[PDB]
Structure 1
Amino acid sequence: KPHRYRPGTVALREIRRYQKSTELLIRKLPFQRLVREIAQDFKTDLRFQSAAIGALQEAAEAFLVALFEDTNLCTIHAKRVTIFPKDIQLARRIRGER
């Protein structure tokens, strides 16, 4: 059982959230620019807490990955196949949401 480091000045629950931020796959500049793109259609005077952008990004990447997990789980072939839009849709109907 590996030795665990527990900083005296920062709780691990904080460290874990910062760690997950570094694991995100979409570049953060294009991500915030996509939020801007959406926000412009609502209201030109909208502001966003930085923390809100981060929450949006963490959840959005999870949402996308789960769509692929579901498609993966519904795809059973001896030889590997390329995933198409129809595959996502069916898997969503079998395993996915609403």
Structure 2
Amino acid sequence: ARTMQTARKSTGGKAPHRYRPGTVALREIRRYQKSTELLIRKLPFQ
């Protein structure tokens, strides 16, 4: 085999999930623009 190669040795063969900032904000925009429920609390306002 290559153990007998004395010159010109043949070397061929051997060796949680986070959302991006701004996404939840936009989703909140979509959520409250569809609804009409009051946003400010009732008792602190009173």
Higher relative contact order (CA 8 A, sep 6+): 1
* Greater radius of gyration (CA): 2
Same fold (TM over 0.5): no
Q: What is the TM-score with the length of structure 2 in the denominator?
A: 0.37
The alignment's TM-score, normalised by the length of structure 1, stands at 0.20
Q: Give 1 or 2: higher helix fraction.
A: 1
